[PDB]
Amino acid sequence: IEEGKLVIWINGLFGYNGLAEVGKKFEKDTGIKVTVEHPDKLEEKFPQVAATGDGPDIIFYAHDRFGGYAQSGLLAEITPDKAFQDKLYPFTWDAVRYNGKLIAYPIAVYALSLIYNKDLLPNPPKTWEEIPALDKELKAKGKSALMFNLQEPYFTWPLIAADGGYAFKYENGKYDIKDVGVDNAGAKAGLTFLVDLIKNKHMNADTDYSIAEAAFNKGETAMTINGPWAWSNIDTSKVNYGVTVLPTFKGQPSKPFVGVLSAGINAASPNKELAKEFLENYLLTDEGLEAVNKDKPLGAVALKSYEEELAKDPRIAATMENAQKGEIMPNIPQMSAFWYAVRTAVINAASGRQTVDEALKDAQTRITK
Ligand SMILES: OC[C@H]1O[C@@](CO)(O[C@H]2O[C@H](CO)[C@@H](O)[C@H](O)[C@H]2O)[C@@H](O)[C@@H]1O
Ligand SMILES: [Zn+2]
Ligand SMILES: [Zn+2]
Numbered sequence: 001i002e003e004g005k006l007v008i009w010i011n012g013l014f015g016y017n018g019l020a021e022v023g024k025k026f027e028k029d030t031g032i033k034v035t036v037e038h039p040d041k042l043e044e045k046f047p048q049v050a051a052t053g054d055g056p057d058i059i060f061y062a063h064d065r066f067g068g069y070a071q072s073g074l075l076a077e078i079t080p081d082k083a084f085q086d087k088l089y090p091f092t093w094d095a096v097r098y099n100g101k102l103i104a105y106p107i108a109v110y111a112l113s114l115i116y117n118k119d120l121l122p123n124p125p126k127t128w129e130e131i132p133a134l135d136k137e138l139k140a141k142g143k144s145a146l147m148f149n150l151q152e153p154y155f156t157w158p159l160i161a162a163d164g165g166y167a168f169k170y171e172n173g174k175y176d177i178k179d180v181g182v183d184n185a186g187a188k189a190g191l192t193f194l195v196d197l198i199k200n201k202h203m204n205a206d207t208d209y210s211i212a213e214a215a216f217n218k219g220e221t222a223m224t225i226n227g228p229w230a231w232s233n234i235d236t237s238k239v240n241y242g243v244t245v246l247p248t249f250k251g252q253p254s255k256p257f258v259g260v261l262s263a264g265i266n267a268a269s270p271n272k273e274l275a276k277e278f279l280e281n282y283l284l285t286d287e288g289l290e291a292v293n294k295d296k297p298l299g300a301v302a303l304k305s306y307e308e309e310l311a312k313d314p315r316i317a318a319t320m321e322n323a324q325k326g327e328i329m330p331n332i333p334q335m336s337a338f339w340y341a342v343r344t345a346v347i348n349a350a351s352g353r354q355t356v357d358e359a360l361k362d363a364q365t366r367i368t369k
Contacts (some may be wrong), residue, residue, distance in 0.1 A: 001054055003270040004011050006278060010060035011047065012038035013229045014261065015027060018295025019060070022288045026278050031277045034278070041232040050074040050266055051233045060277070062259035067331035071099040071265065076265040076272055078102045084280055092302040095328060104264035105279050107289075110227050110299030111256040111323035112158060114247060117172075120239040121222040126315065128193060128254075133291045135202040138222055147212040148203060148225035150198070153342040155225055156340040158256040158326065160190040162249035167257075168330050175330045182342060183364035190249060192356045195349050205350040228299040228319060243315040246322055256326035261298065307345060333365070342365045 001007065010016050010022070016038045023034025024320035036058070043065045049055035051074065059069075069075050080102070085093060092106035115268040116124040120143065125131055135145035136280045149155045164186020181187060197203045204211075216224040217237035226247065234241055251320050263283070265275045282288050284308045292298060293310070299319050310316050329335065345363035348354035354362075 001266065001269055001271070001303045003056055005035070005055040006058065006271055006274055007035045007055040008060065008255075009037055009039055009042050011042065011062075011261075011295070012040075014060070014298070015225075015292040015295025016162070017294035018358045019191055019212065019283075021291045022283055025287075025291075028044075029263050030274075030277075032274055041305075044309065047072065049075065050268060053268040055266055055268070056272045057265055057266055058275050059266065060228045060261060060263050060324070062329065063262045063331050064259065064329040064335045065331075066096060066262060066264055067098050069335040070101075070103045071333045072109045074267050075103045076263065076267045076269065078105060078107070079276065080280065082169050087304060088284070088302040089304060089307070091328075093261055093312075095331070096262050096264075098331060103285065104262040106302040107261045107263055107284070108301045109258060109260050109323065110117055110229075110247065111258045111319055111326055112155065112225050112227050112327065113243045113318050114223060114240050115215070115216065115226055115230070116223045117219055117221075117243050118246065119138070120219065124223065124242065124244055125247050126245075128162075128249045129244035131247070132197065132200065134222075144215070144221045145202065145222040146225075147203070147207055147215045148223075149195075149207065149209045151208045151347070152341060154257065154259075155341070155344050156194060157252035158225075158246055159194055159249055160187050160314075161255040161327075162186070162252050165190055166327075168332065170330065175332050175336050177193065177332065178368055180338075180364055180367050182338075182367060183360040184212050184343070189357055189358060191346065191349055191360065193249065194346075195356055198350050199352075207355075225336050228297040228315070231315060232295070234258045237310040243318040244320065245325070253325040254322075256322050257329045258323045258326050260302070267287075270286055 002157035009282050020036040026034055043061050046055055067297045081245050096104040096106050138145050166181035168177055169179040198205050211222050215221040263279050271299050284303055289301050289303055300316055345359040349356045349359040
């Protein structure tokens with residue numbers, strides 16, 4: 001890491017170009033060059049490189065990955081004063097607190113919502129159970145009912161947790177890493193339904209982010225599941241779409257895992273003062289957030305002043321409604337294991353290489369091993 005400049009990493013799904021614009025205003029005003037990159041699998045890359053003393057000066061990613069980094073001493077403790085802390089909703093601050101210490105700056109809160117084509121389906125389904133019949137019906141027009149990324153468990157987890165599945169129970173003031181619910185009845189029921197949709201051919205196990213996006217933006221599928229970041233391309237496609245509550249399962253709401261996009265500062269960085277200045281005085285301001293938000297919508301931002309101007313947007317109201325029905329992700333070091341195990345379980349169950357029961361049993365065992 002070079003002293004006198006800022007290198008930032010952020011998930012390619014978000015508005016990295018919008019974040020670069022903020023970096024340019026910073027450079028103009030300060031003279032410091034800000035380089036924004038979106039490396040592949042940055043959440044796994046950062047740990048590796050940061051452990052040797054390099055990597056970016058600032059890393060932007062969902063808060064669930066940060067506990068792992070902090071435990072490894074890869075994050076500098078941020079030092080925001082009371083006046084600044086008061087500018088962001090306190091619940092977003094709790095999302096980046098680890099071991100009684102703040103390890104990152106909250107930027108935005110997001111969750112998945114059901115997105116549907118108003119012209120193909122005026123009244124979206126309130127339940128998962130009615131999608132199969134609805135799909136067959138749309139097949140009589142060469143169209144499908146629902147397409148969404150089945151490769152990443154973040155997308156399928158809302159259904160799995162609906163009837164009772166869960167990661168780590170939060171109890172006694174902390175996350176119980178032995179009390180895991182990926183192999184219970186609730187979780188099995190939800191994944192069995194998903195896998196049935198795939199085997200019965202209402203969905204294809206190969207559907208990924210590209211497939212689902214192209215299908216919905218070309219009006220070939222009535223619905224999709226995605227986050228705020230996808231709204232930009234949908235607007236560009238001209239689809240008359242709506243953003244609403246995820247359907248229910250066995251009479252219960254789908255429970256999406258709520259993520260808080262956070263900016264953490266590399267412990268090995270020689271530009272910690274500059275990082276703080278950029279985040280607190282350039283990014284986390286109405287101006288900075290609007291810049292990023294106009295690139296790719298962030299969802300409900302942590303900045304109270306700006307969030308008030310965004311709250312009006314019904315798409316954001318829908319995001320929050322889904323978020324309140326779900327659960328803020330835990331940020332413990334074991335989350336990496338949870339995601340890896342679940343990602344594998346869903347993939348094997350969906351590809352036939354394993355029965356739902358097997359898949360989940362193995363994920364559960366590996367998560368608590
Ligand atoms: O492709 C998944 C997409 O979802 C996010 C939402 O924050 O990641 C979440 O889900 C992953 C598994 O699907 C986890 O590995 C990750 O830690 C979690 O935040 C995005 O970051 C990601 O691009
Ligand atoms: Zn069917
Ligand atoms: Zn693919």
